[PDB]
Amino acid sequence: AQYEDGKQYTTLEKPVAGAPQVLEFFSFFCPHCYQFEEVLHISDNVKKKLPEGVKMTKYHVNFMGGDLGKDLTQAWAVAMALGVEDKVTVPLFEGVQKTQTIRSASDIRDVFINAGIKGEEYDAAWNSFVVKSLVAQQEKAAADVQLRGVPAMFVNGKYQLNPQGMDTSNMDVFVQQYADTVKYLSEK
DSSP, X not given: OOSOBTTTEEEOSSOOTTOOSEEEEEOTTOHHHHIIIIISOHHHHHHTTSOTTOOEEEEEOSSSSHHXXXXXXXXXXXXHHHXXXXXXXXXXXXXXXXXXXXXXXXXXXXXXXXXXXXXXXXXXXXXXXXXXXXXXXXXXXXXXXXXXXXXXXXXXXXXXXXXXXXXXXXXXXXXXXXXXXXXXXXXX
């Protein structure tokens, strides 16, 4: 075939019922995730090619960066709850990996404050039970697929993107290949 199991994707031998349609995992500590977000705009280009009716979910993971790793997962929960993903993603990545000014929960908070979320509403979200279950969701999903590495993408709980089986000499071509593969898997 042109799309072969073990080549551009792998099949989970333990399929995850009821999973979100397109499911992506990242860490703000993850260097290829930084690339995937700010240089390649993977998430974005995938959605540009997904059919009608297909929902896209993106979750943060704990297994990088220890204590701040977890803080970040809670902050991403807050980001989802307030719908401000698009205003904090880039400053969180640059804060962790570029400028290295994110060293504590308070530094994470400053990013939101600077991006215009109010202290009052940030702290309320941060401490809210809606955020707690949203953290639980992020962890459950990673758990459902025994996730040990990011970036990672899953389609319908049964296929996992395999970017290492795609040429990277051209970044535009890599992205479309990646996106087209998600689209192919989406219609499987």
